[PDB]
Amino acid sequence: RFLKVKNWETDVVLTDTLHLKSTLETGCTEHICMGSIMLPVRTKDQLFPLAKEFLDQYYSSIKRFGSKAHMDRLEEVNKEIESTSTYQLKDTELIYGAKHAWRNASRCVGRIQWSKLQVFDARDCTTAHGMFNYICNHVKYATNKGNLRSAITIFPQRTDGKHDFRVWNSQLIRYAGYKQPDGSTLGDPANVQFTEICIQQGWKAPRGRFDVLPLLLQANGNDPELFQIPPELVLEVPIRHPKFDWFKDLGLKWYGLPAVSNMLLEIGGLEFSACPFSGWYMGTEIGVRNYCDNSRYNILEEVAKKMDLDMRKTSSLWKDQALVEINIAVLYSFQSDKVTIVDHHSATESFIKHMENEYRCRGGCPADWVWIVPPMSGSITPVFHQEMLNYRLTPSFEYQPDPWNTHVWKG
Amino acid sequence: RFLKVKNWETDVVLTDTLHLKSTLETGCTEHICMGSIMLPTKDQLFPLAKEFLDQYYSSIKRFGSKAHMDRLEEVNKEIESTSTYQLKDTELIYGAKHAWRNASRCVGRIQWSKLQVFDARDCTTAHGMFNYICNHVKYATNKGNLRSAITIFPQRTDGKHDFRVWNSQLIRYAGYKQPDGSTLGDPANVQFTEICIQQGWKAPRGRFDVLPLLLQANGNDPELFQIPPELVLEVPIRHPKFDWFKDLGLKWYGLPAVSNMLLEIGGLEFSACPFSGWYMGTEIGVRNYCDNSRYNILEEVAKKMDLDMRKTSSLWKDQALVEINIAVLYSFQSDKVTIVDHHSATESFIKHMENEYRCRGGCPADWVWIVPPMSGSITPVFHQEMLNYRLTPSFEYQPDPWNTHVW
Numbered sequence: 001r002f003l004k005v006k007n008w009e010t011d012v013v014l015t016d017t018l019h020l021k022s023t024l025e026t027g028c029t030e031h032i033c034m035g036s037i038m039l040p041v042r043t044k045d046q047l048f049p050l051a052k053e054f055l056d057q058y059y060s061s062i063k064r065f066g067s068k069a070h071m072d073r074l075e076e077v078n079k080e081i082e083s084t085s086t087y088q089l090k091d092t093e094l095i096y097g098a099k100h101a102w103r104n105a106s107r108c109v110g111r112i113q114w115s116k117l118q119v120f121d122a123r124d125c126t127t128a129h130g131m132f133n134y135i136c137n138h139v140k141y142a143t144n145k146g147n148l149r150s151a152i153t154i155f156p157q158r159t160d161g162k163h164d165f166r167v168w169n170s171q172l173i174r175y176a177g178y179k180q181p182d183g184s185t186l187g188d189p190a191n192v193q194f195t196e197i198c199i200q201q202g203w204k205a206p207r208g209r210f211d212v213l214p215l216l217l218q219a220n221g222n223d224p225e226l227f228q229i230p231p232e233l234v235l236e237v238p239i240r241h242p243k244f245d246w247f248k249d250l251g252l253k254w255y256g257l258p259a260v261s262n263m264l265l266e267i268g269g270l271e272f273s274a275c276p277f278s279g280w281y282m283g284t285e286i287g288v289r290n291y292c293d294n295s296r297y298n299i300l301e302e303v304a305k306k307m308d309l310d311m312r313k314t315s316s317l318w319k320d321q322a323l324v325e326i327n328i329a330v331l332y333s334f335q336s337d338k339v340t341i342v343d344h345h346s347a348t349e350s351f352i353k354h355m356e357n358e359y360r361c362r363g364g365c366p367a368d369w370v371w372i373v374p375p376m377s378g379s380i381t382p383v384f385h386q387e388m389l390n391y392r393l394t395p396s397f398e399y400q401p402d403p404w405n406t407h408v409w410k411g
Numbered sequence: 412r413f414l415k416v417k418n419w420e421t422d423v424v425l426t427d428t429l430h431l432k433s434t435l436e437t438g439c440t441e442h443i444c445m446g447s448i449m450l451p452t453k454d455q456l457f458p459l460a461k462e463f464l465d466q467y468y469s470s471i472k473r474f475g476s477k478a479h480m481d482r483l484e485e486v487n488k489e490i491e492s493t494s495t496y497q498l499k500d501t502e503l504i505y506g507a508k509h510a511w512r513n514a515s516r517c518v519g520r521i522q523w524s525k526l527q528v529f530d531a532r533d534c535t536t537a538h539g540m541f542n543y544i545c546n547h548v549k550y551a552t553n554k555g556n557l558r559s560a561i562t563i564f565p566q567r568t569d570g571k572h573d574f575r576v577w578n579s580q581l582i583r584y585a586g587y588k589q590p591d592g593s594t595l596g597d598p599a600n601v602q603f604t605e606i607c608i609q610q611g612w613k614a615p616r617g618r619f620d621v622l623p624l625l626l627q628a629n630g631n632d633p634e635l636f637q638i639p640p641e642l643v644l645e646v647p648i649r650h651p652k653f654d655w656f657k658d659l660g661l662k663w664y665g666l667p668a669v670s671n672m673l674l675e676i677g678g679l680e681f682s683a684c685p686f687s688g689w690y691m692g693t694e695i696g697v698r699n700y701c702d703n704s705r706y707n708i709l710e711e712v713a714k715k716m717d718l719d720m721r722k723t724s725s726l727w728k729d730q731a732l733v734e735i736n737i738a739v740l741y742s743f744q745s746d747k748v749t750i751v752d753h754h755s756a757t758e759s760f761i762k763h764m765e766n767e768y769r770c771r772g773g774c775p776a777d778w779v780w781i782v783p784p785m786s787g788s789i790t791p792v793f794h795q796e797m798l799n800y801r802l803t804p805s806f807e808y809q810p811d812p813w814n815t816h817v818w
């Protein structure tokens with residue numbers, strides 16, 4: 001089967017054959033599209049096919065499909081599974097796997113960069129202190145004094161599901177949120193629940209607007225343990241505006257390193273429940289989502305008030321005006337401080353080039369339009385008019401529930 | 412069976428049961444989501460008729476009544492004998508309102524029950540079509556206080572006698588390929604303009620020439636008519652702060668009137684069913700003005716604003732976009748022509764969606780179209796999960812008639 005996508009600005013048509021390798025399910029059926037739904041121990045039996053599918057893909061990528069090395073690796077893994085009920089990836093397969101999970105991440109507009117990912121193998125890690133050390137090293141390597149480098153750190157895989165490695169933080173670096181008795185929130189409302197857990201685990205909260213959360217790290221299914229990232233490793237950018245000198249007095253800053261720490265990496269049927277990965281920001285993530293979402297820092301009113309916009313009616317587009325100025329400020333600040341950031345015009349133009357290249361060289365590029373289109377100025381970016389096909393390829397990154405919901409407490 | 416949708420800003424959760432009554436296919440499968448693809452006999456007709464008449468009688472609280480059974484009987488008899496049937500006026504009005512109610516891509520559905528339905532099933536000629544359309548246009552326009560309306564021409568019979576409006580909207584601007592290489596006017600309408608000229612239209616060859624109607628009655632070859640200039644309300648575009656803005660010479664028409672879609676009710680197909688509402692500001696200022704394949708004015712505006720156009724990261728495009736959209740809204744408001752901004756429209760849709768969930772058990776919605784083309788996440792629809800599915804009565808896309816018509 002060939003599936004066509006059209007771009008409605010350019011009339012360019014592409015043909016997808018890669019979807020034929022799709023395996024997992026979308027949530028959609030012939031009767032219902034779930035395209036805007038955010039969330040729409042294995043057996044030896046199911047595992048060897050998953051292993052084999054992966055190793056066939058790996059060995060094809062290196063032009064060794066069907067080689068003795070390929071056949072021998074299949075035999076080796078087969079016997080490891082039947083004898084130990086799981087298997088270990090070779091380092092090269094781990095690197096390939098992690099790179100492909102990113103390449104396959106359909107919500108990620110930054111995938112042009114997928115082949116340039118530093119993979120840190122932390123499968124020898126045994127303790128939460130060990131995890132803390134690996135995470136500091138990742139942070140320092142990825143930050144690179146503002147010249148950001150993409151990285152992933154991979155902790156030991158799931159065994160029986162009772163010995164999971166987990167990072168309880170949603171991101172390595174994130175700000176605390178504190179619900180006040182009057183119902184207001186100090187800091188970042190997205191992180192209230194996790195902040196409460198940290199405090200219950202013994203963190204002494206500074207109780208300010210931008211407190212970097214401690215790491216809460218679980219090794220080998222044990223109860224998690226608190227660690228503070230050395231402050232000198234957390235690069236932050238104070239936010240100012242190129243023309244509005246009062247913008248700085250809003251007291252805003254953000255951290256430079258976006259590092260997702262709550263997802264599960266599946267490679268060849270193996271599950272890496274702790275696999276923190278990081279890149280660099282697209283400006284709208286800070287300027288649109290983190291600052292202007294109503295359930296986040298929610299700064300639109302204050303900015304608009306300081307700008308003396310007409311706020312009596314929505315039709316003056318005061319919210320749109322303030323939004324643009326905040327996003328200008330974020331890009332200006334990061335650039336002035338020499339911290340890697342990409343604007344949404346650059347990011348989306350690069351994604352479309354990536355996507356076209358993928359169609360030609362790979363036969364497709366699964367993409368989730370809902371997430372790929374930027375949260376402001378959508379239609380003036382080249383992704384808006386691009387038709388996309390969303391399907392799930394493995395290796396992959398997957399959502400997993402927050403660990404406090406599932407963890408069996410030891411005491 | 413029971414499906415939940417969550418709002419990620421407000422944590423509010425809603426349960427959809429209405430999707431169980433969905434019928435047409437989405438284009439998606441369990442393997443591949445096509446959510447972002449724009450276009451993804453006697454035996455068949457009676458189940459469709461029955462399904463519709465059942466919902467109708469249910470809606471007037473007379474389900475299973477003798478008048479219900481008698482009507483099903485009557486329609487059955489009519490299909491067996493004529494191979495089609497005629498809707499009662501009451502059923503026609505209901506079906507048209509519900510086709511709007513069911514339009515998953517429409518953000519303006521809070522208005523669905525206030526639709527003026529003009530029954531043009533007695534129309535027989537292209538001239539008759541023109542009269543009906545001028546009357547629709549004048550009624551809907553209403554000196555700028557716009558009123559939603561649909562005009563419904565005779566249903567499809569054997570498919571060789573279709574009524575069609577060849578225009579994509581009742582009011583739209585011509586587009587002309589220039590010897591220059593560029594496009595004068597609206598590039599969206601280049602092909603249709605050519606057909607008009609080929610059919611004999613004398614084109615003024617300007618930037619905003621209102622297209623003539625090309626009307627097809629009874630499967631006959633389509634004929635040209637010019638809408639009375641005085642029935643076409645237009646708005647010159649100015650900005651409340653930028654004096655130079657008016658000198659771009661921009662204008663738009665007040666009446667958005669889709670004329671190329673097919674209305675399906677109870678299995679019957681109305682291939683000519685122009686309908687109209689009023690604009691959301693971004694439709695003109697973001698889409699019509701700023702799409703690269705449309706009037707594409709971003710560069711000229713940014714230039715007049717003297718923005719740094721050297722690097723994308725100055726966000727000059729975003730700045731010019733906002734200003735263009737401010738001017739569209741200000742111009743329509745100053746001339747007292749109905750228009751809605753995207754903040755107000757999306758807020759009203761969320762309110763409508765909650766109503767529909769509570770009263771109907773759901774509201775099919777296509778997030779890709781419902782989220783405005785600018786400032787998406789600061790509107791209340793962005794964080795709203797939506798379920799997309801197809802209910803009948805419905806409005807369907809149909810191919811442009813020049814691909815299909817035999818002359």
Ligand code: HEM
Nearest residue numbers: 102105107108109110113150277278279280281282371397
């Ligand atoms: C290098 C620069 C990168 C940029 C500019 C970038 C940009 C983005 C953006 C804007 C999103 C969606 C956020 C939203 O719409 O709310 C996203 C999501 C995502 N990215 Fe990338 N990203 C980058 C690197 C990476 C890396 C290194 C990985 C993994 C190795 C990755 C994997 C993902 C995944 C799995 C998602 C979905 C996240 C989720 O479901 O929560 N990205 N990225």
Ligand code: HEM
Nearest residue numbers: 511514516517518519522559686687688689690691780806
């Ligand atoms: C009264 C105010 C109305 C508003 C503000 C409104 C708004 C809109 C908008 C913004 C779109 C999509 C435009 C885009 O995102 O590019 C749309 C699409 C649509 N609307 Fe509404 N509309 C209104 C009236 C109506 C009426 C009266 C009907 C039918 C009686 C209707 C049926 C539809 C349909 C079928 C679509 C999808 C059209 C297509 O597929 O091309 N709308 N509307």
Ligand SMILES: Cc1cc(N)nc(CCc2cncc(CCc3cc(C)cc(N)n3)c2)c1
Nearest residue numbers: 038258259260277278279280281282285399
């Ligand atoms: C319920 C739920 C499901 C899901 N799949 N993801 C989320 C979190 C979405 C999310 C929120 N803030 C931030 C991110 C990070 C996106 C991101 C990741 C990377 C690696 C780089 C970059 N520039 N940006 C992701 C929530």
Ligand SMILES: Cc1cc(N)nc(CCc2cncc(CCc3cc(C)cc(N)n3)c2)c1
Nearest residue numbers: 289293370371372373374375419420793794
């Ligand atoms: C667990 C959880 C709870 C909660 N209340 N909110 C969240 C974050 C939801 C959220 C809000 N804004 C942004 C995102 C990023 C994901 C995202 C979602 C959509 C719909 C579009 C798009 N471009 N990106 C996610 C997560």
Ligand SMILES: Cc1cc(N)nc(CCc2cncc(CCc3cc(C)cc(N)n3)c2)c1
Nearest residue numbers: 449667668669686687688689690691694808
């Ligand atoms: C290939 C294709 C498929 C499809 N279903 N629609 C289209 C046209 C989409 C389209 C473009 N401009 C304008 C409209 C009309 C939208 C519209 C309709 C009404 C009635 C009111 C209002 N405010 N806005 C629709 C193209």
Ligand SMILES: Cc1cc(N)nc(CCc2cncc(CCc3cc(C)cc(N)n3)c2)c1
Nearest residue numbers: 008009384385698702779780781782783784
């Ligand atoms: C027949 C036809 C050909 C062509 N090349 N373009 C078109 C118009 C395509 C088009 C471009 N921008 C906007 C729209 C409106 C429909 C629309 C599409 C999407 C993806 C989001 C959204 N909010 N609204 C339609 C139609």
Ligand SMILES: OC[C@@H](O)[C@@H](O)[C@H](O)[C@H](O)CO
Nearest residue numbers: 170190191192193194262402
């Ligand atoms: O405060 C807890 C939240 O940060 C957490 O539930 C996240 O939203 C979740 O991990 C999704 O990223």
Ligand SMILES: OC[C@@H](O)[C@@H](O)[C@H](O)[C@H](O)CO
Nearest residue numbers: 579599600601602603671811
């Ligand atoms: O030139 C004709 C086009 O406007 C026409 O093909 C439309 O794009 C089509 O009717 C869909 O709106």
Ligand SMILES: [Cl-]
Nearest residue numbers: 288289375788
């Ligand atoms: Cl957002």
Ligand SMILES: [Cl-]
Nearest residue numbers: 379697698784
């Ligand atoms: Cl658009």
Ligand SMILES: [Zn+2]
Nearest residue numbers: 289293788794
């Ligand atoms: Zn958001």
Ligand SMILES: [Zn+2]
Nearest residue numbers: 028033439444
């Ligand atoms: Zn789908």
Ligand SMILES: [Zn+2]
Nearest residue numbers: 379385698702
């Ligand atoms: Zn567009």
